[PDB]
Design an enzyme around this catalytic site. Structure first.
Site, PDB file in Angstrom:
ATOM      1  CG  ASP A 138      -1.818   1.194   1.300  1.00 34.56           C
ATOM      2  OD1 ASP A 138      -1.935   1.885   0.273  1.00 34.56           O
ATOM      3  OD2 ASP A 138      -2.431   1.416   2.374  1.00 34.56           O
ATOM      4  CB  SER A 144      -2.184  14.270 -13.502  1.00 36.02           C
ATOM      5  OG  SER A 144      -2.574  13.998 -14.836  1.00 36.02           O
TER       6      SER A 144
END
Length: 330
Positions: A35, A199
């Site tokens: 994770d 992004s």
């Protein structure tokens, strides 16, 4: 040193991925959910409340000659999906894919929430976010990667998750045969303890690319792609009959649909998520309403590039003095 381990989807939907991890002496192999959005290595154990264990493999520290109680240390964690676990702490030898750390904090669960109990395939979590998020008290502990880093050939690990197929976590090297083209690197902020990046935009299907900054986290422990409501609405508007359902808890779509792809930007580069990666199947057994793999982050407080996004790429988690993230197509 290096390590390399195969990671395997837990079910036909790629709801999560499990990777075998050797703990203790002699080795006890547990299948852990790696994770990159948390920083605790915790396991089902011989200390876990018996009624809360249902099929998981447990770590038994009393059977490990290298286990030592970390005196006074406790831990307690709550995840974004509302699940939780807590317990005490041992140090022990932990190996992943041939890479060994001695003195790793292994957090032994005394209590786990129902969603953990109900998932027989996940024996615990191995956190790979920054150690500043580790929950051990009163002495915070380091992640497996943080402990291994100085010994690694290069201070990196990579995630290569498969679509409906096994993939690989590598530590200490970049497998140049595992991706196509080049790796595009992008800046990381560690201020919230995550692999947080920006992004450069998105496209839906064959549509034009929208240049827009989207701050979010690379999180292998989250199944879906969670993005701003504007972006998500633009995606689902291209699917006839798709709608946001408050009763189901997100966007659903007719199972008869062919889904468009979704592209996200990494600098000037582009990662394409095929439409099929966005299908999470019937909302309930036999239903013709299917659950979407792109969902709104509104009210999470952060955008999450979960498995839906990451499995479309070869992803480098670069833990150099100034961390960065790399993405390549594959």
């Amino acid at each position: 040193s290096t390590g390399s381990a195969t990671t395997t989807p837990i079910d036909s939907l790629d709801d999560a991925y499990i990777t075998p991890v050797q703990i203790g002496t002699p080795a006890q192999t547990l299948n852990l959910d790696f994770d990159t959005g948390s920083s605790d290595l915790w396991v089902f154990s011989s200390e876990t409340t018996a009624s809360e264990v249902d099929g998981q493999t447990i770590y038994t520290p009393s059977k490990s000659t290298t286990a030592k109680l970390l005196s006074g240390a406790t831990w307690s964690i709550s995840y974004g999906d509302g699940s939780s676990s807590s317990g005490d702490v041992y140090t022990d030898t932990v190996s992943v894919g041939g890479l060994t750390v001695t003195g790793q904090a292994v957090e032994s669960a005394k209590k786990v929430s129902s969603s953990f109990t109900e998932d027989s395939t996940i024996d615990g979590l191995l956190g790979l976010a920054f150690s500043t998020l580790n929950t051990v008290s009163p002495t915070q502990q380091k992640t497996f990667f943080d402990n291994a880093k100085a010994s690694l050939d290069s201070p990196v690990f990579t995630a290569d998750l498969g679509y409906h197929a096994p993939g690989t976590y590598n530590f200490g090297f970049i497998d140049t045969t595992a991706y196509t083209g080049s790796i595009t690197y992008t800046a990381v902020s560690t201020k919230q303890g995550f692999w947080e990046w920006t992004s450069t935009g998105y496209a839906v299907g064959s549509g034009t690319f929208k240049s827009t900054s989207i701050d979010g986290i690379a999180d292998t422990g989250t199944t879906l792609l969670y993005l701003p409501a504007t972006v998500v609405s633009a995606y689902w508007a291209q699917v006839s009959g798709a709608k946001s359902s408050s009763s189901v808890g997100g966007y659903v779509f007719p199972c008869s649909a062919t889904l468009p792809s979704f592209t996200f930007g990494v600098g000037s580069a582009r990662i394409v998520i095929p439409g099929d990666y966005i299908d999470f199947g019937p909302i309930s057994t036999g239903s013709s309403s299917c659950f979407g793999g792109i969902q709104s982050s509104a009210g999470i407080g952060i955008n999450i590039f979960g498995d839906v996004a990451l499995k479309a790429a070869f992803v480098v988690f670069n833990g150099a003095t100034t961390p960065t993230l790399g993405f390549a197509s594959k």
